[PDB]
């Protein structure tokens, strides 16, 4: 396992748009187009960044092309973050996955919002953090993937990932 097999678990994959959780429009795996409220702003935003006349539609290749240049985005967000970067520094291989995986899904800012959870795990102090997570919202809307989100920083395992 890695991230993109991780994320890949976790996001689906869709070749329509579609709104996530959030609400917003979104396609392949987890690609955010717009936090706008209009289909069209979608629909444009996707055909500038897909570059041809998607109509709503991408290809499997497109999908594959974004998740790729959204997770290296995720991984630069973080190490350009004051308050993310030490902490990412500081874990395992597995649990900076989870981090990222977190970046990914709320952003960098949404992520840096959770203080004291970075501070615990900065920490090493697994439990209390998985324990702090599970008291977002998040936790309440992706309780399936935040699960498992929380028992990777907690455990240091990938078996949150390994179908048993």
């Given at each position: 396992m890695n991230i993109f097999e991780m994320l890949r678990i976790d996001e689906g994959l869709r070749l329509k748009i579609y709104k996530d959780t959030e609400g917003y429009y979104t396609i392949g795996?987890?690609?955010?187009?717009?936090?706008?409220?209009?289909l069209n702003a979608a629909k444009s935003e996707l055909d500038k960044a897909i570059?041809?006349?998607?109509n709503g539609v991408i290809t499997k290749d497109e999908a594959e092309k974004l998740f790729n240049q959204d997770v290296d985005a995720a991984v630069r967000g973080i190490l350009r973050n004051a308050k993310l970067k030490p902490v990412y520094d500081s874990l395992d291989a597995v649990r900076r996955s989870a981090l990222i995986n977190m970046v990914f899904q709320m952003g960098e800012t949404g992520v840096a919002g959770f203080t004291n959870s970075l501070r615990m795990l900065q920490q090493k102090r697994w439990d209390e953090a998985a324990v702090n997570l599970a008291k977002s919202r998040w936790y309440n809307q992706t309780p399936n993937r935040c699960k498992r989100v929380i028992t990777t920083f907690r455990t240091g395992t990938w078996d949150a990932y390994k179908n048993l």
């Open positions: 795996i987890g690609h955010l187009l717009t936090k706008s409220p209009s570059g041809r006349n998607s």
